[PDB]
């Protein structure tokens, strides 16, 4: 249910209002999924997961060609249903620039 409230009603504010200078809010996003279940991760992450692969590639610097591709192909779909939801759409553009 809580997946639906950040992706279908108000895009993350830790990827829109986050300061790009030091990215302090962006890594709060990352760390609070380390406080949310990882014992049962691949049953509730499909909007949240896109966020996860994004964050590991950029924050922690996991630049692999395969990792890059996996995110891009997935992110085309993802862009294709929330490029018309409010806020979420503006956040996708940030992600792409990064």
């Amino acid at each position: 249910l809580a997946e639906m409230a950040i992706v279908t009603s108000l895009g993350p504010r830790l990827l829109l209002s986050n300061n790009p200078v030091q990215n302090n809010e962006l890594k709060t996003l990352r760390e609070i999924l380390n406080e949310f279940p990882d014992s049962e991760r691949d049953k509730w992450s499909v909007s949240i997961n896109v966020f996860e692969v994004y964050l590991k590639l950029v924050l922690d610097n996991v630049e692999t060609q395969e990792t890059i591709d996996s995110l891009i192909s997935g992110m085309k779909i993802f862009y294709d249903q929330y490029k018309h939801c409010r806020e979420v759409a503006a956040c996708c553009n940030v992600m792409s620039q990064e």
Partner: protein, 290 residues
């Protein structure tokens, strides 16, 4: 809508509707002939598929969908299929068909089990109403199909045998592996993924055969604990039959894949199952592979 535009006729037969239009062969009479043809059809020497096909009678979707809508092949410029087929087939707008199919099956107006099939043919997740009730085996089956379809599509895409024309709805072109599938499968179905026969099912596909032989020996060491001596090895007696037998086969095959020591401890466990019973005739055949 022929029967009444506002207030007209009330009969359902052609000539009591419009007299312009003749009675066709329909109802029960169609059904009798249907049966007649079906009897002939269960003669081939392949009466197991021929029978399945034969019942998908009447509507075109039942039988026609199964006859295939296929990917382009032309055996005139291709020599390698010119002894396998003698004529050109397969629609060249196959990819385009696949995307249209996807959009239909997710919408209702047809039976739920029908919907899960159509979606599954094109490389997509079945309809929600069925997907919720699938077990481990059914869930697994779906996700392996996806890996095959994504990789094939990637190699063909580069030689430009599949274009933008075919795209009505995108599919991804991401890389996947089985290891990732099992983590999807296990997080949806926790009790079933630990189910004994199903553990071994996963392990062959990744080829994690040597490792799994060793892991079992470690468990046997743990067995001197009380929690362990009580349970987690008396809970699946038939799975220890399988592991010892597999262990022999891998060590004949190459006794450095996994240890002789690891094979030898496992035998000690198979021997305990002989001990429960009271057999001692069979021990020397096992003793040669210790």
């Amino acid at each position: 809508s022929i029967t009444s535009g506002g207030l007209k006729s009330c009969d359902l037969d052609f000539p009591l509707r419009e007299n312009t239009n003749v009675l066709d062969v329909k109802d029960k009479e169609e059904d009798h002939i249907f049966f007649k043809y079906i009897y002939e059809l269960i003669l081939a020497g392949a009466i197991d598929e021929a029978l399945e096909e034969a019942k998908l009678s009447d509507n075109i979707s039942i039988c026609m969908i199964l006859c295939g809508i296929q990917e382009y092949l032309n055996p005139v410029i291709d020599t390698q299929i010119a002894n396998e087929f003698n004529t050109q087939q397969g629609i060249k707008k196959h990819s385009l068909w696949r995307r249209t199919v996807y959009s239909l099956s997710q919408q209702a107006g047809l039976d739920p089990y029908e919907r899960a099939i159509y979606s599954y043919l094109s490389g997509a997740i079945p309809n929600q109403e069925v997907l919720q009730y699938s077990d481990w085996e059914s869930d697994l089956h779906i996700h392996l199909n996806q890996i095959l379809q994504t990789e094939i599509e990637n190699y063909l895409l580069e030689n430009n045998q599949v274009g933008t024309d075919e795209l009505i709805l995108p599919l991804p072109s991401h890389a996947l592996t089985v290891q990732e599938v099992l983590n999807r499968v296990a997080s949806r179905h926790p009790s079933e993924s630990e189910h004994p026969i199903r553990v071994l099912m996963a392990s062959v596909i990744l080829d994690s055969l040597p490792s799994v032989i060793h892991s079992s020996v470690e468990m046997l060491l743990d067995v001197v604990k009380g929690t362990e001596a009580s349970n987690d090895i008396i809970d699946k007696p038939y799975l220890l039959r399988i592991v010892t037998h597999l262990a022999i086969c891998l060590d004949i095959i190459n006794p450095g894949s996994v240890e002789e020591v690891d094979k030898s401890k496992l035998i000690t466990t198979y021997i305990s199952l002989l001990k429960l019973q009271g057999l001692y005739e069979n021990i020397p055949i096992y003793a040669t592979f210790l």
